[PDB]
Amino acid sequence: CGRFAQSQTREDYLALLAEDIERDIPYDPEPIGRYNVAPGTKVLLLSERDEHLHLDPVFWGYAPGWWDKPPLINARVETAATSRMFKPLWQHGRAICFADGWFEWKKEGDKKQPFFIYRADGQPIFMAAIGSTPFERGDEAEGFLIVTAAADQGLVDIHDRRPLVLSPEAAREWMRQEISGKEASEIAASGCVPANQFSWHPVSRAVGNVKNQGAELIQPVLEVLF
DNA sequence: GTCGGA
Secondary structure, three states, rough: OOEEEEOOOHHHOOOOOHHHHHHHOOOOOOOOOOOEEEOOOOOOOOEEOOOOOOOOOOOOEEEEOOOOOEOOEEEEOOOOOOOOOOOOHHHHHHEEEEEEEEEEEEEEEOEEEEEEEEOOOOOOOEEEEEEEHHHHOOOOOOOOEEEEEEEOOHHOOOOOOEEEEEEEHHHHHHOOOOOOHHHHHHHHHHHHOOHHHHHEOOOOOOHHHOOOOOOHOOOOOOOHHO
C-alpha cells in the first residue's frame, strides 16, 4: 500500500463520482501521467468542503511535530477511528485518493517481485484516505494517509495488507462533511471492495525506481526475465 | 498517539 498509479485525466476519475455542479475543480484535459506515485510526494487528493468536491495536491505522509519516526503513510482500518493519533483525521479529515491500481512487492526469496493490482471490471479505484485539514495549505509534514485493510482471498499471496478501496457510491458518502465518524466506520465496512474484484500481474522491476513514471510500468511481464 | 522499495 505504498505505491500506486494515477495516470489518467481528472475527468476519467471524477465522472464516476460527481457532475460539475458538485465540483469546485477546474477543467483540465491533461492526463495526470503518474504511473509511479510515491510517499512524500504531493498527490492530487479529493475531498469535500463548502459542499463541493475539491482536488488539492497533498503530501502523502503524516508526521506531527511530536512524531519522531519517518512519516506514516497508512492507517489501519481496524483501529484508525478510535486511535489517539488518527481519530480526529477519521472524523474531520476524510478524503479519497483515486488511482488506476496499486503496486505490491512479493517476496520471492531474497528478491522482491512487483505486481500491479487493479479492478477486473476496469474501473479506477477510490482509495479511502484520512489526513490533516486544511488540505489546501500544502503542508510538507502533515498530509494524508491511505487507509488499509487485511488482504483477502488471493491477494494474501502477494502481501498481508491492501488499501481500503471503496465503491464510487461509498467514496462519495465517505467524503461528506455531514456524516459522523461512526457513519464513516459503517461506510468503510459496507463500501469496501473485496479481493475477488481485483486482478493482478507481475510488472517490470523498473517501478522500484521513482524516476520512472511511464505507462510501461503497469504492463504484465514474465517473472523469468527479471 | 505506528506502519512500499529503487
